[PDB]
Design a protein around this ligand. Structure first.
Ligand SMILES: CNc1nccc2ccccc12
Ligand SMILES: CNc1nccc2ccccc12
Lengths: 268, 265
């Protein structure tokens, strides 16, 4: 992989692996989400930031501050096949004091056509107290020299799906998958549950018949609270409709919300 | 990746990814096991298999893993390039063997090695069978004729008999279930998931202060998509050794048995 000519974005190619594909012999949405995080990490390393998933700067490290995902939005037009080469371009933008945004464009390497796009909202948090804060001038200036100055959006359209408000699923859920627990392979290098695991847990409550006859086109996921290594999760889904669903991940015991989301599926 | 000059083995390079590493910023044993299966699949494609032969496909026959044995001397770091060479050998009518050698691409030194035993099974009835001459001849032209072993030693760890863990287990992890990411392209639980489930019953203190050196895993029965598994471990031992058992949560039906060897960091 490499930073582009102007140094304001990063590109990387990936060959889709045999264990990365589902029943249609094309990459799963979790494989796509892992590749998005991999190219994001390689972009941060290339410009001298922390590589542990937090993309931390000098002044953030001293203050015990980290970047955490608030929302992930992914739209796939065509899933790359096993053995195919996918090219992913990524860039970051400051969103004033609110936080940062990381965007991605996925392309078929052979044809050059756009096969997918993604966007993510990140907020600043103290890693110890878990308290959120606005972005200071000191931190904005340090990130701004690595971001395009004019707006560059993967989702430019007015009132697009990436900015919609997600409601809270009401009991009873139409479908559920209970007792979901992370194993060591679900953890990152910091022993925290990887953000992609939550995407998998959301999808666990979609019936197998939908998965077998439909393709996932859009997924929007809000992150409210983290699942700890010894926590247990319940995944809930209700049809709201193409097939659309409303999703809720909550702790198995007290019912504490960890995530909420929506998915849109197209008939094969 | 590519077949080597003589066409009897296959090599491929991999750059270790950020999500593929553990707490020490080096590849997990499950990442290694996934790379081993990926290079095995690329070797099969390069010589025209899909790893069934023409005779196997009409008879509804498949190769299934009976045992996996992996030894790691040094886990590759995040961002490091690892080179893996793999080859197959026929073991008469018993089945086949796939071997691997892992090397650090920069230094060229051997950082790991692995071996696996495969048996022929009817896809539908799940009945095992001896390898016929028709199948044997079809794959022999893709294998070295003289023996080539990743584990040549006289009394090596890859061929040891594994006993059945006796209740009560010293440690356990209960209620393990596969999710869709644990399934392969055929909707079967990926062989690497079982390695993860075995390791789930090792205490976090061992993982935090030791490095996994050797893992030997026998495959007896498959975990179905709607099955639930219990992972059991008992210490058998500067080095720590454990005996492992995976069994179905309900009836206690054995699915796997294994052993692990860990060295102090
Ligand atoms: C995936 N990592 C994380 N997600 C949420 C909150 C976190 C707080 C501290 C360190 C890591 C965190
Ligand atoms: C990982 N795949 C498998 N493991 C065991 C038995 C199997 C039987 C039929 C098809 C696939 C099988």
């Amino acid at each position: 992989g490499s930073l582009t000519e102007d140094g304001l974005s990063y590109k990387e190619k990936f060959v889709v692996r045999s264990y990365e594909v589902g029943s249609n012999k094309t990459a799963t949405v979790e494989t796509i989400a892992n590749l998005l995080q991999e190219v994001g990490c390689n972009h941060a390393q290339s410009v001298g930031f922390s590589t542990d998933g937090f993309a931390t700067t000098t002044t953030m490290r001293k203050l015990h501050l980290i970047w955490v995902t608030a929302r992930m939005h992914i739209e796939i037009y065509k899933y790359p096949a096993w053995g195919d080469v996918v090219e992913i371009e990524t860039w970051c933008q400051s969103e004033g004091r609110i936080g940062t945004r990381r965007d991605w464009i996925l392309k078929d390497s052979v044809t050059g056509e756009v096969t997918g796009r993604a966007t993510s909202k990140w907020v600043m948090m103290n890693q110890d107290t878990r308290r959120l804060q606005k972005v200071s001038d000191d931190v904005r200036d340090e990130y701004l020299v690595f971001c395009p100055q004019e707006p560059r959006l993967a989702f430019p359209e007015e009132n697009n799906r990436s900015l919609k408000k997600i409601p809270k699923l009401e009991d009873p859920a139409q479908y559920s998958m209970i007792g979901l627990k992370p194993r060591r392979a679900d953890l990152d290098m910091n022993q925290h549950v990887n953000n992609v695991t939550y995407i998998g847990w959301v999808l666990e409550s979609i019936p197998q018949e939908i998965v077998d006859t439909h393709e996932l086109q859009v997924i929007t996921l809000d992150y409210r609270r983290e699942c700890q290594q010894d926590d247990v999760v319940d995944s809930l889904t209700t049809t709201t409709s193409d097939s659309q669903f409303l999703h809720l991940l909550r702790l198995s015991g007290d019912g504490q919300e960890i995530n909420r989301g929506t998915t849109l599926w197209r008939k094969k």
